[PDB]
Design a binder for these strands. Structure first.
Ligand code: MN
Ligand code: MN
Ligand code: MN
Ligand code: MN
Ligand code: MN
Ligand code: MN
Lengths: 244, 244
DNA sequence: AAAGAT
DNA sequence: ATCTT
DNA sequence: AAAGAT
DNA sequence: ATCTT
C-alpha cells in the first residue's frame, strides 16, 4: 500500500544516504550546523523526493503548500477522490544519547483543528488521514572543520553534526500525547516514549475522535485547565461527569 | 577592517555562488524547497565559512552557540580582549517582487536586552557590537522537477526556489524599528524599507542608547503600551515628560 | 510540566 | 526564526 | 498593524 | 518549528 511503501522507502533512503552539506551550482559545499533548526530542514528536504516517488506510484497527486506556514508539508490525493486527501507532516527531535525517550511538537491545537480552513492547505474536513513522519537524531557538536568549504571530492571528509538517525511514519492521533508540546505557540505534545513505541503506535488515545475532542477543549494555560482537565484521565472524568 | 572585509566577502560569495541543494556523502542531491524555513537555514550555513575566514584573517576567535535557543549565531572576540565581543546574527526575509519594502524580525526584546545572561552565549555586557547579516530573496514557486534527486553532473539544472538574493551587514540598532516584529514571541521589528536603506543605515533611532531604552521599556500588548508608548514619537514625548 | 525562548 | 491575517 | 500561526 | 529553563 501507499503507507507500507512509504515507510519502507523512508527506512531505506535513510539507510543508504547521509546528508552532509548544502551544495552550490558551481560545486562548492557548505557543512551543516548542529541544531534542530538546521536538521529539521534537512530531513524534510531529504524526504520530498521519496514521498513524491511513492505517491505517484500509487496514483496520488502531491502538493506542497503554496503559502507559508500552512499545514501540511504534503497533501496527497487522487483527483477521483477529492475529499479523501492524506496529510503528511515531517517532525524532527533530538536525543542526547542513542535510544532514550523522545517527544515531538505536533502542530497547533488552535488552528485548523478548531477551525476548518485556518492555516491549512485544504479545508480540514477533506482529509481522511494525518500522518507524521518523525525523525530522531543524536546531537554531536560542530567542530572547527565544519567552518570550511569543500568540493565534490572531499564528501566523506565533511563532518556530520549528527549520528544515529531514525525515521518513522505513524498516524498523528496515535502518537499524540495529553500535555502541550509548547506554550506561547500552543502545540500538541506527542507521547514521550521510545522510538519503537512511535513505530508500533503505543499511544494513549482510544480513537482519533477522542484525540480530537481532547485537543479541541484543552485550555491554553494551566490556570484555565486547572479545574477542567490537564491530562487524559482528568479529561475522561470530565467527559464522564457531563463535560463540567 | 573585520567589518569591511566581511561585508566585501559576503557580497562576493553571494555573487559567485548559488546554493542549489543538499548533498549526501554518497553524492546524491536533494533540491531546495521555497519557504523562508528552508532559506533562512540555507543562508545561515552559507555564511558560516565566510564569517570564520574573515574572522581568522583578523585574529578573531569564532564561537557559535553550544546550546540551542541562544543568541547570537556567531560571537567573535580577540583572545587579548575578551570583554570586547562582537555578536553577528543572520536574518532572512523575502520579497514577492524585486525590491518592494522588506522588514526583519530581529530577536526578542525580553530576553538578553532585559537580563544580562538570558538566552545569550556570553553575558550581554561583554559585547561591544551587535551586527545583523541580513539576506533578502525574491520568492519563486517550486517546480515538479524539485521532487526528483540529482547527481553532481546536473548541478546547473537543479531548479532554485529563489532569485535575486541580496545581502547586507549593519548594526542591529541602526536598522531597528519601533513596532514589534512578532507578537507571541516578542521580537523587535526592524524598519520597513528598501534594501538600500539597510545597507545605508537610514533608521529611526538617534542612537543605540535610545534603541535599547525603547525596547527595554516596550510593553508586550496593545492595551499595555497604550498608557506608555506604541511608537518612537510617543516614546520621545514620554521621555520628554519625565518617563511617564 | 509550564511558559516563554530561537 | 519569521510569517500570515 | 496586533496577535497568533508554522 | 522545537527547544530550554
Ligand atoms: Mn514539518
Ligand atoms: Mn490561509
Ligand atoms: Mn541561527
Ligand atoms: Mn539567525
Ligand atoms: Mn514589505
Ligand atoms: Mn542559557
Amino acid at each position: 500500500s501507499l503507507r507500507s511503501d512509504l515507510i519502507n522507502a523512508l527506512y531505506d533512503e535513510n539507510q543508504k544516504y547521509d546528508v552532509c552539506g548544502i551544495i552550490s551550482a558551481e560545486g562548492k559545499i557548505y557543512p551543516l550546523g548542529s541544531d534542530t533548526a538546521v536538521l529539521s530542514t534537512i530531513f524534510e528536504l531529504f524526504s520530498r523526493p521519496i514521498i513524491n516517488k511513492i505517491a505517484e506510484k500509487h496514483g496520488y497527486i502531491v502538493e506542497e503548500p503554496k503559502q507559508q506556514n500552512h499545514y501540511p508539508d504534503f497533501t496527497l490525493y487522487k483527483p477521483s477522490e477529492p475529499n479523501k486527501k492524506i496529510a503528511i507532516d515531517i517532525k524532527t527531535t533530538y536525543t542526547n544519547k542513542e535510544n532514550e525517550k523522545i517527544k515531538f511538537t505536533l502542530g497547533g491545537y488552535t488552528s485548523f483543528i478548531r477551525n476548518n480552513t485556518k492555516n491549512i492547505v485544504y479545508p480540514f474536513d477533506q482529509y481522511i488521514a494525518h500522518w507524521i513522519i518523525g525523525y530522531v537524531y543524536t546531537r554531536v557538536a560542530t567542530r572547527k572543520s565544519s567552518l570550511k568549504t569543500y568540493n565534490i571530492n572531499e564528501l566523506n571528509e565533511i563532518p556530520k553534526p549528527y549520528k544515529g538517525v531514525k525515521v518513522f511514519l505513524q498516524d498523528k492521533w496515535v502518537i499524540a500525547g495529553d500535555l502541550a508540546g509548547s506554550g506561547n505557540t500552543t502545540n500538541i505534545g506527542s507521547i514521550h516514549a521510545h522510538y519503537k513505541d512511535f513505530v508500533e503506535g503505543k499511544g494513549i488515545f482510544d480513537s482519533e475522535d477522542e484525540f480530537l475532542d481532547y485537543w479541541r477543549n484543552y485550555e491554553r494555560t494551566s490556570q484555565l485547565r486547572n479545574d477542567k482537565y490537564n491530562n487524559i484521565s482528568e479529561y475522561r472524568n470530565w467527559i464522564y461527569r457531563g463535560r463540567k
